[PDB]
């Protein structure tokens, strides 16, 4: 039975550096061309690095993405694949995988590479002014917009927990930037607009930070 | 080089074709992975093989498009597929293309388009918020315009995540400076679900 097991990975600050290594059973795996290929989270695969077997003499070959600052080696005594990830990007932040072979047949668990500074930041909370537009007559749409924070999660109520009809808060978007954003809208009563009043209270545990945002009509 | 389309859905039991473009991909080697939410991929194994009895797993790989087909398709085989091949520098993928297996009527999304607030604007900022709720299968494209150029930078999309009716929902942001926001007649968010779009259009005036 073909294993490949997957180490190293954890958070890291961007310009820092990294070791991953691959644990691989149940193959000779002295007779293997070995891979490491990436996932970004919610993206595709992007191959990063491949060493081929002890008789071609294990050169190394790599990406254009990660050329000179990753190294890829292996311990064919320890039967372990490794890979040095130096001067690490944002943009490398994704799940590393160990996959067998120029046929790629076999692949681990992976395992995940942050590349972030690890840095609490509380939300800004903007209100998004009731629109009828896109919803059912006599109702009309409203919202909160919580945006750049870290780390999950936040927590969106409506009036203080009192109105919960209607109420669709998001999964939240992880950005570019390493931060966070949600956000959460509520169906109401377009007769109700500016006789109610509402108000999003939104909790980031992690910064301490609590907002009551009140949302009014344009 | 290599081209997926975004998504494909099938009737439980009948075939379903997922290709993938590239030019001269027929004098490649095409790979297959079939990766289900949360797991790693594995290495979709698949006959080139003419004829015999028919296969659940097949490839054709001829000029420019290699497809995978999929035969007797059941909710099991939902995932996202992604190709490969060899290329001069390493491997080349895909960008991947979601089964979906129907298990209930297609749903048409329910779009939602927010300018940027006021309040967002007077801290130097602007976004837009287009939420995607109640559609199936869980796989839509979001595109955006600026007036009708298409616009790609500042875009973040989430990945379709399965409501409490079994339905999907998706939400995607346009970051913009309040300069940028202003000096458009319009930005609109544009969603495709299944061949057809809605597009929703605001304007800073």
């Known amino acids: 039975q073909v294993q490949l097991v997957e180490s190293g990975g954890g958070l890291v600050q961007p310009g820092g550096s990294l070791r991953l290594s691959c644990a691989a059973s149940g193959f000779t795996f002295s007779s293997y061309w070995m891979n490491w290929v990436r996932q970004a989270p919610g993206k595709g695969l992007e191959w990063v690095s491949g060493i081929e077997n002890k008789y071609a003499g294990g050169a190394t070959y790599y990406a254009a993405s990660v050329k000179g600052r990753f190294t890829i080696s292996r311990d064919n005594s320890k039967n372990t694949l490794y890979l040095q990830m130096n001067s690490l990007r944002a943009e490398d932040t994704a799940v590393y995988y160990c996959a067998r072979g120029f046929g790629t047949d076999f692949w681990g668990q992976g395992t995940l590479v942050t590349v972030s500074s690890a840095s609490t930041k509380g939300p800004s909370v903007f209100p998004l002014a009731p629109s009828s537009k896109s919803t059912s007559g006599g109702t009309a749409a409203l919202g909160c917009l919580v945006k750049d924070y870290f780390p999950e999660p936040v927590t969106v109520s409506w009036n203080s927990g009192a109105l919960t009809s209607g109420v669709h808060t998001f999964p939240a978007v992880l950005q570019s930037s390493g931060l966070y954003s949600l956000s959460s809208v509520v169906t109401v009563p377009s007769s109700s607009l500016g006789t109610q009043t509402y108000i999003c209270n939104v909790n980031h545990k992690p910064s301490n930070t609590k907002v009551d945002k009140k949302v009014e009509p344009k | ?81 992604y190709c490969s091949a060899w290329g001069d520098k390493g491997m080349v993928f895909g960008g991947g293309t979601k089964l979906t297996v129907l298990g209930q009527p297609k749903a048409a999304p329910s779009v939602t388009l927010f300018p940027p607030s006021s309040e967002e604007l007077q801290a130097n900022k602007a976004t837009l918020v287009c939420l995607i709720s109640d559609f199936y299968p869980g796989a839509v494209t979001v595109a955006w315009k600026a007036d009708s150029s298409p616009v790609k930078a500042g875009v973040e999309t989430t990945t379709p995540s399965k409501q409490s009716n079994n339905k999907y929902a998706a939400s995607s942001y346009l970051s913009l400076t309040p300069e940028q926001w202003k000096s458009h007649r319009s930005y609109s968010c544009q969603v495709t679900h299944e061949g057809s779009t809605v597009e929703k259009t605001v304007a800073p005036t």
């Open chain 2, 1 to 81: 080089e290599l081209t997926q389309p975004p998504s494909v859905s099938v009737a439980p039991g009948q075939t379903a074709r997922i290709s993938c473009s590239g030019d001269s991909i027929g004098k490649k080697y095409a790979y297959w992975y079939q990766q289900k939410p949360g797991q790693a991929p594995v290495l979709v194994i698949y006959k080139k093989r003419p004829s015999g009895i028919p296969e659940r797993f097949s490839g054709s790989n001829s000029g420019n498009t290699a497809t995978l087909t999929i035969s007797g398709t059941q909710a099991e085989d939902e995932a996202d597929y």
